[PDB]
Enzyme design. Sequence first.
Site, mmCIF file in Angstrom:
data_model
loop_
_atom_site.group_PDB
_atom_site.id
_atom_site.type_symbol
_atom_site.label_atom_id
_atom_site.label_comp_id
_atom_site.label_asym_id
_atom_site.label_seq_id
_atom_site.Cartn_x
_atom_site.Cartn_y
_atom_site.Cartn_z
ATOM 1 N N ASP A 13 0.794 -1.215 0.000
ATOM 2 C CA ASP A 13 0.000 0.000 0.000
ATOM 3 C C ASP A 13 0.842 1.288 0.000
ATOM 4 O OD1 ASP A 13 -2.687 1.144 0.197
ATOM 5 O OD2 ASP A 13 -1.984 1.872 2.185
ATOM 6 N N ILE A 15 2.109 4.715 0.830
ATOM 7 C CA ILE A 15 1.588 5.792 1.666
ATOM 8 C C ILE A 15 0.102 5.971 1.393
ATOM 9 C CG2 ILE A 15 3.743 6.932 2.221
ATOM 10 C CD1 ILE A 15 3.207 8.870 -0.143
ATOM 11 N N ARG A 60 2.847 -11.818 2.667
ATOM 12 C CA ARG A 60 3.030 -13.259 2.563
ATOM 13 C C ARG A 60 2.434 -14.046 3.730
ATOM 14 N NH1 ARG A 60 9.307 -12.887 1.922
ATOM 15 N NH2 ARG A 60 8.718 -11.137 3.244
ATOM 16 N N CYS A 82 9.514 -2.527 -7.332
ATOM 17 C CA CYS A 82 10.202 -2.567 -8.600
ATOM 18 C C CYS A 82 11.675 -2.445 -8.458
ATOM 19 C CB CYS A 82 9.749 -1.416 -9.465
ATOM 20 S SG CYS A 82 10.101 0.201 -8.776
ATOM 21 N N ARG A 263 8.852 6.107 -4.494
ATOM 22 C CA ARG A 263 8.296 4.850 -4.965
ATOM 23 C C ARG A 263 6.787 4.843 -5.082
ATOM 24 N NH1 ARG A 263 11.270 2.029 -0.099
ATOM 25 N NH2 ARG A 263 9.631 2.158 1.552
ATOM 26 N N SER A 264 6.120 5.980 -5.002
ATOM 27 C CA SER A 264 4.668 5.922 -4.938
ATOM 28 C C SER A 264 4.048 6.063 -6.320
ATOM 29 C CB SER A 264 4.135 6.994 -4.012
ATOM 30 O OG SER A 264 4.341 8.210 -4.671
ATOM 31 N N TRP A 265 2.739 6.166 -6.333
ATOM 32 C CA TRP A 265 1.986 6.393 -7.539
ATOM 33 C C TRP A 265 1.800 7.877 -7.773
ATOM 34 C CZ3 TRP A 265 -2.353 2.607 -5.891
ATOM 35 C CH2 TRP A 265 -1.980 1.309 -6.255
HETATM 36 N N1 LIG Z 1 6.478 -8.505 1.954
HETATM 37 C C1 LIG Z 1 5.802 -7.362 1.840
HETATM 38 N N2 LIG Z 1 4.487 -7.271 2.286
HETATM 39 C C2 LIG Z 1 3.782 -6.077 2.182
HETATM 40 N N3 LIG Z 1 4.382 -4.965 1.619
HETATM 41 C C3 LIG Z 1 5.681 -5.046 1.202
HETATM 42 C C4 LIG Z 1 6.415 -6.225 1.300
HETATM 43 N N4 LIG Z 1 7.657 -6.021 0.788
HETATM 44 C C5 LIG Z 1 7.705 -4.745 0.365
HETATM 45 N N5 LIG Z 1 6.495 -4.139 0.610
HETATM 46 C C6 LIG Z 1 6.105 -2.750 0.311
HETATM 47 O O1 LIG Z 1 5.651 -2.628 -1.015
HETATM 48 C C7 LIG Z 1 5.729 -1.277 -1.406
HETATM 49 C C8 LIG Z 1 6.237 -1.210 -2.819
HETATM 50 S S1 LIG Z 1 6.244 0.477 -3.455
HETATM 51 C C9 LIG Z 1 4.480 0.681 -3.616
HETATM 52 C C10 LIG Z 1 4.113 2.100 -3.187
HETATM 53 C C11 LIG Z 1 2.631 2.390 -3.461
HETATM 54 N N6 LIG Z 1 2.335 2.079 -4.870
HETATM 55 C C12 LIG Z 1 2.294 3.826 -3.067
HETATM 56 O O2 LIG Z 1 1.395 4.436 -3.680
HETATM 57 O O3 LIG Z 1 2.929 4.420 -2.163
HETATM 58 C C13 LIG Z 1 6.711 -0.643 -0.472
HETATM 59 O O4 LIG Z 1 5.949 0.154 0.379
HETATM 60 C C14 LIG Z 1 7.252 -1.768 0.375
HETATM 61 O O5 LIG Z 1 7.523 -1.399 1.707
#
Ligand SMILES: Nc1ncnc2c1ncn2[C@@H]1O[C@H](CSCC[C@H](N)C(=O)O)[C@@H](O)[C@H]1O
EC number: 2.1.1.37
Lengths: 284, 284, 183, 188
Positions: A13, A15, A60, A82, A263-265
């Site tokens: 998710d 932020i 997981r 990514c 790293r967000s959208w």
């Molecule tokens: N095993 C896991 N379970 C849940 N989230 C995880 C994870 N491994 C990494 N992540 C999370 O996955 C996210 C990938 S970046 C995704 C950011 C999101 N699209 C936004 O709008 O902000 C990162 O926040 C990372 O911390």
Amino acid sequence: MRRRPIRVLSLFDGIATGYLVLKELGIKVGKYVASEVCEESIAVGTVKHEGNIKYVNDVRNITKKNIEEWGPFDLVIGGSPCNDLSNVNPARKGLYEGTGRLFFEFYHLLNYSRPKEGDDRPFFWMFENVVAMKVGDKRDISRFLECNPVMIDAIKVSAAHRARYFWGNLPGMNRPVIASKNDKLELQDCLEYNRIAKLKKVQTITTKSNSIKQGKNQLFPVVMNGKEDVLWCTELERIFGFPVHYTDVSNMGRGARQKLLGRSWSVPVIRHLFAPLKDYFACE
Amino acid sequence: MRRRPIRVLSLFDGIATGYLVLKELGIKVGKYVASEVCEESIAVGTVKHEGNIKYVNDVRNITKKNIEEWGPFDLVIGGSPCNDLSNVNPARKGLYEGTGRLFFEFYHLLNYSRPKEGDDRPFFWMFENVVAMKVGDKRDISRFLECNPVMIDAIKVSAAHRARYFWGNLPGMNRPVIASKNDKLELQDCLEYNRIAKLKKVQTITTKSNSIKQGKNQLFPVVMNGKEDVLWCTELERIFGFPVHYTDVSNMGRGARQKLLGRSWSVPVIRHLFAPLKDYFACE
Amino acid sequence: MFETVPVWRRQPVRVLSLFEDIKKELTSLGFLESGSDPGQLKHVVDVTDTVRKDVEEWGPFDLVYGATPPLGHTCDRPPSWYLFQFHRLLQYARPKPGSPRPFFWMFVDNLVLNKEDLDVASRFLEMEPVTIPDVQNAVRVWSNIPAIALVSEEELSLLAQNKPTKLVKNCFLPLREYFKYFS
Amino acid sequence: GHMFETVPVWRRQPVRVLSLFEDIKKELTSLGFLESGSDPGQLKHVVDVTDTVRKDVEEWGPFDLVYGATPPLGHTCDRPPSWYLFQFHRLLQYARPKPGSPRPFFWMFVDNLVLNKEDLDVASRFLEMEPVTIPDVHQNAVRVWSNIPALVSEEELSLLAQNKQSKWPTKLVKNCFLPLREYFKYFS
DNA sequence: GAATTCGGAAAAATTTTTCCGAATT
DNA sequence: GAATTCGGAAAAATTTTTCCGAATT
Ligand SMILES: Nc1ncnc2c1ncn2[C@@H]1O[C@H](CSCC[C@H](N)C(=O)O)[C@@H](O)[C@H]1O
Ligand SMILES: Nc1ncnc2c1ncn2[C@@H]1O[C@H](CSCC[C@H](N)C(=O)O)[C@@H](O)[C@H]1O
């Protein structure tokens, strides 16, 4: 019958962009379960949304029974990490190792939460990832989700390059992206008072500080009081389309806030994609 | 007969609390000349006040002609550095050395800006400094400003101890300090969502992070999600009474923002002192 | 759990087997008959471009089988690839909820999966594996086939360190209670 | 610091001077500005100004000259060297004539090399002028700020300062005081 | 009484820059 | 065909913690 609030499962998710965009569109959110592991990200979603997000930690460890009890769900969204798929990392580990293999967790839980064939009820889902990724990876993700992606570059609605792939079944995902009136389309629109933008659109922002200085010879984007400067975090927030100070949380500084935002959208891109949902769930 | 906007000389301006308190009271500010040398403080005042503050840099380069040209002034305020005067610093250099001697610059320019005999026009001034200071220093400052100070502790109108001396000639400076309706008088009032205050009032906040952890055994002030934590910068802003994100400027992090806030004025205490000025200048 | 089929109703099993071909091992126990050169077994080895419509046309299927490459063969593919791909097409092959009939699947690992790979396998195939030894070689099996002893992992750990249809066959025999018994 | 017209000889009066830190009483008579017959002496000398109010300076009657000086180089100072500066400035403003009654009024401050260079620009910022460096030739020197209408490079004094550490030389001061002869009585 | 405080020089942590790097566009 | 990119291990800064410390409430 009548409109009901939307129930959302959101994986990776970050932020809580998913929640913010739904709220910004005026959609009643009945349940928003978010899977997320970074403690500073969780603080952002918590504080900025007053405890409405139900956090469930590592993707997981969500079980088949978890999906049943926490559900039903109307919307399943996610954008996986990514860092092991993008071209930036020479040490990329691909789709099947490292964090790349986290995509299959989304594929897996998407299938748990999908209604059965007897159920004709509305069910929507979307998965996002970068374009800078091997063709074999782009092929295999479209093999598991069983469809091809749209490419939307945030540059059409924001002041930054950001080409992303979106897979899913939302209405009108292939339609043209037209900018809105409130879209800050040029870097000057994003900057604070007494600062000058050198360029109209900035290169794709990543989690590192190198992405802020532009081009092949790493030029500063801003001039203030005659001297060159990098971007401020409020300015990054505006480029991504987040409310300003959205990440002014948890004592985070420049680098931490850029990592979350990097790293967000792109909020305006997500708003475009989610906007067709107003006619399926309750509004405010 | 009719009032004009106030004209303000502010020395050692910090993050422009003087201007903010004037704006919050509804007083038209016609001119606000600020002397200040810290680049991040100036960034705060610039940004947060949209270029209305006329910055003039090191107090010791303001000339007799400058005061004539930039003037007339209706209000001359300042709080000089108390790092060579406070009890915290064992390496304090006193009133006549180090930064202590910057006080006399305020004394010097106060007298340049004072109207002459025959001018019955309103002229107001105020000087602030710490209580934790040698009696000889407190005596000599009252020798140069020719009057004794009032002592106002912010704890009457905020969630923090903050005892300071105020010299000056504003109306009603010796009157009782009664709290207002919007005053956040307890630490819980200042905190973000999902955070618990252990105490009701925190110890005097300085520029160092040890001042946040409470008492002789250095206790964390806040509990979040079961674990102990320090205060966040929005929470510090609220204790001082600044708007939240007032210092979310210039890519500053936790340490920088605490330094600006740690050495600033408590806004509610300052408002109380300036409030009698509404009846002498133009309002909004 | 599936009810057992009276002997006169049993039919020749239709099996889809991936990566490995168990064709003439499965005839050795009488599940296929020699003469169906267009047999009731479909064999594929590069699934990466196969769609659901491909599996649906080769269907219906009663058994779906997949296995890791043999321990030693230095694979051109990540060891988890055989898992996730097996999982993908198994879901294409399942009976619809509207028509429940006996339907079984098997996956077996040659010790080609490490332990983070193993926790993915047991999460996706919804069960811990069964460790079947030879006394030296061993395989791990996930399946929903009802089956009929103790080893610790350090033997296998050290066996894998150092550098198999026999063990996979036996578990195939509770399927005799569901399909025709040729030969 | 003002420019003043000069007074005809028959209108001149005995100067009233306030002297701080160092007394020029028995030196200023040597030039004829004071007489040994006065009960008040027309000179007021005080040395611990820290508890002096304005009305104390006003009660001590009007003043035409205000003088202060740093203690002598060879004096282990009990006071920060800038203290004599700020304090002199503090009472000089108490002593100035009001803008409504402009009359001749002068002030002097002199330093015994007891101020270092960051203290020196405080001095010249507050007293609104650079100082004049007056030397002694067969080695000593003082620097004077004053509004009275009265070459060595600094490393000469720099190195002079550092050896000297191991009293007040009125000889240098006195002469500066002369021009005031054009404004006040000149006792034989 | 002993608790308090508009700090700072070292010292130990976290942190923000040099090059890094290549497939996809 | 030269530019681009939801990154990271070392390396060089920057920063955030130990003791510090005493006159004034
Ligand atoms: N095993 C896991 N379970 C849940 N989230 C995880 C994870 N491994 C990494 N992540 C999370 O996955 C996210 C990938 S970046 C995704 C950011 C999101 N699209 C936004 O709008 O902000 C990162 O926040 C990372 O911390
Ligand atoms: N020579 C100088 N000229 C002008 N300002 C100076 C200065 N030396 C130090 N300062 C500034 O004086 C301030 C002392 S703290 C004053 C804080 C201010 N009253 C507020 O409300 O924030 C600091 O901002 C410091 O940067």
